[PDB]
Write a protein that binds this ligand. Structure first.
Ligand SMILES: [Fe+3]
Ligand SMILES: [Mg+2]
Ligand SMILES: [Mg+2]
Ligand SMILES: [Mg+2]
Lengths: 211, 197
C-alpha cells in the first residue's frame, strides 16, 4: 500500500529528536502505553483473532492525516481497536460508550490482499536481483524506494514465514517463504541525492526476480 | 479542511479498549500487567551489551554471533518476541552499520529493549535511509567520508543488532567494564562506544 507510512526517502523533515546517549526516560511515559502491545499479543496469542501482520496493515489503514498527527503508541491503540471491531469481537458503540466520546478507527481495507506468489526463485548469496516492478494496494513489506531497483543478496534466511501480502489480510494462502537481505548501493536508490553508502532491505522471496 | 477528527482523550480510549475486552473474559488475569513487567524489566539493551562484551573478548563467540545470531543469543536465553531470528552486523574500520524500521518501529526487543520515541519518529524513519551521515552527525556521531555507512531497514522478520568496533584504551578490561560502555544507541548503530578521558 503506497500510504503515507512509507516514509523512507521523504524530504522536508527536521532533526531527529535525540542526541546520542541522551535520557529517553522510562519505557512507558504514560500509564496506558503498555496496553497497545499487550492487547495486540492477547489478540494474536490468546484469542487467535489476528496476526501481527494484520496489526501493521490496520495501522497503515489509518486515514493519512490521522496517521500523521497521531503518536506511535496511540496508532496501535487505534489499530488494535479497529481489528477487534472488524473481527466482530467488539463494537465501536461499546468502545465509544466506555471511552466517553469519539473513537475513530482505521479505514476499511480496499484490497482483499494477494496469495503467496506461485512462481519464485531460490536465490544464492552474491546473486544480483531486481525488486519486482509491482504495485500492491494491500499490505506489502517492500518500501517503495526499492521497487524496480537492483541489488545483491547478502543473506538468505534459514527460516521461512507467511507472505505478508496474504497473512496481513487474514488469508488462508500465505504459504511460507524465506527472506533475503538485499544490498543496494545508495546511488541505486537515490541517485546523487544521498550521503550514504549502502542500504540493506529484508525482502520476501516473492518480491524478487533475477536481475 | 485537513482538521483533526474529534477524539476522546487517548488514555480514555486505551482503557476503554482494555475494559471492553476484559469485561468479556478475553484477557487472562494479570495478562497486561505481566507484559508491562516483561517490557520494562526483561527486554533490555543491557542484554545486547553483554553479548557485545562477550564477542569482544571471545573470538569463538564473536564468530558464532556473526554467522548464527539466533544460536548465540539463545545461549544466553535472550530470544523472545520480536527477537526470534537475530542477525548481528559487524562494524569495521571501513564500515559503519545503522538500523531502522522505515515502515513502523521493528526492533530486536529482547536484546535492545523496546524502541525509543526518537527511533519511531517520522524524522528518523524518513531520513536515516537517505542521509545517514548527516543524521548521525546531527545526533552527535561523526562518521568520516571514507567509512561506508550501511543502513539495515527492518522490513521483515530479521531482527538486528550492531556489533560496534572495540575502542582503543579498553585493552584488558573485564566483560563488566566493557558492557558499561555499550549503550542502547551503540546497538542501534547511531553511537560509537565511548571510553572516559
Ligand atoms: Fe517496525
Ligand atoms: Mg510512497
Ligand atoms: Mg584487542
Ligand atoms: Mg583489570
Amino acid at each position: 500500500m503506497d500510504g503515507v507510512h512509507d516514509l523512507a526517502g521523504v524530504q522536508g523533515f527536521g532533526k531527529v529528536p535525540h542526541t546520542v546517549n541522551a535520557d529517553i526516560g522510562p519505557t512507558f511515559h504514560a500509564e496506558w502505553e503498555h496496553l497497545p502491545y499487550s492487547l495486540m499479543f492477547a489478540g494474536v496469542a490468546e484469542l487467535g483473532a489476528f496476526s501481527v501482520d494484520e496489526v501493521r496493515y490496520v495501522v497503515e489503514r489509518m486515514e493519512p492525516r490521522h496517521y500523521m498527527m497521531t503518536p506511535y503508541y496511540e496508532r496501535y491503540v487505534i489499530g488494535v481497536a479497529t481489528l477487534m471491531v472488524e473481527k466482530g469481537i467488539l463494537t465501536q458503540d461499546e468502545l465509544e460508550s466506555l471511552a466517553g466520546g469519539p473513537f475513530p478507527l482505521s479505514r476499511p481495507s480496499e484490497s482483499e490482499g494477494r496469495p503467496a506468489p506461485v512462481e519464485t526463485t531460490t536465490f544464492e548469496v552474491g546473486q544480483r536481483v531486481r525488486v519486482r516492478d509491482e504495485y500492491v494496494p494491500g499490505h506489502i513489506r517492500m518500501p517503495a524506494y526499492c521497487r524496480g531497483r537492483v541489488g545483491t543478496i547478502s543473506h538468505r534466511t534459514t527460516e521461512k514465514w507467511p507472505f505478508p501480502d496474504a497473512i496481513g489480510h487474514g488469508r488462508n494462502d500465505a504459504g511460507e517463504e524465506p527472506t533475503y537481505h538485499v544490498k543496494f548501493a545508495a546511488e541505486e536508490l537515490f541517485g546523487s541525492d544521498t550521503d550514504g553508502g549502502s542500504v540493506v532491505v529484508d525482502l520476501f522471496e516473492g518480491y524478487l526476480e533475477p536481475a | 479542511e485537513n482538521a483533526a477528527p474529534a477524539q476522546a482523550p487517548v488514555s480514555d480510549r486505551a482503557w476503554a479498549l482494555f475494559r471492553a475486552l476484559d469485561g468479556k473474559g478475553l484477557v487472562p488475569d494479570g495478562y497486561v500487567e505481566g507484559w508491562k513487567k516483561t517490557f520494562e524489566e526483561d527486554f533490555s539493551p543491557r542484554r545486547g551489551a553483554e553479548l557485545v562484551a562477550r564477542a569482544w573478548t571471545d573470538p569463538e563467540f564473536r564468530q558464532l554471533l556473526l554467522t548464527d545470531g539466533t544460536a548465540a543469543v539463545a545461549q544466553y536465553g535472550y530470544l523472545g518476541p520480536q527477537g526470534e531470528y537475530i542477525v548481528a552486523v559487524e562494524d569495521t574500520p571501513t564500515l559503519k552499520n545503522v538500523i531502522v524500521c522505515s515502515l513502523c518501529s521493528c526492533t530486536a526487543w529482547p536484546i535492545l529493549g523496546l524502541p525509543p520515541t526518537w527511533y519511531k519518529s517520522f524524522e528518523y524513519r524518513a531520513r536515516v535511509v537517505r542521509e545517514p551521515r548527516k543524521v548521525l552527525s546531527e545526533m552527535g556521531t561523526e562518521i568520516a567520508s571514507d567509512i561506508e555507512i550501511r543502513v539495515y531497514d527492518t522490513t521483515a522478520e530479521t531482527r538486528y543488532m550492531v556489533l560496534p568496533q572495540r575502542p582503543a584504551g579498553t585493552e584488558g578490561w573485564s566483560q563488566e567494564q566493557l558492557q558499561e560502555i555499550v549503550t542502547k544507541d551503540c546497538l542501534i548503530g547511531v553511537a560509537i562506544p565511548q571510553v572516559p578521558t
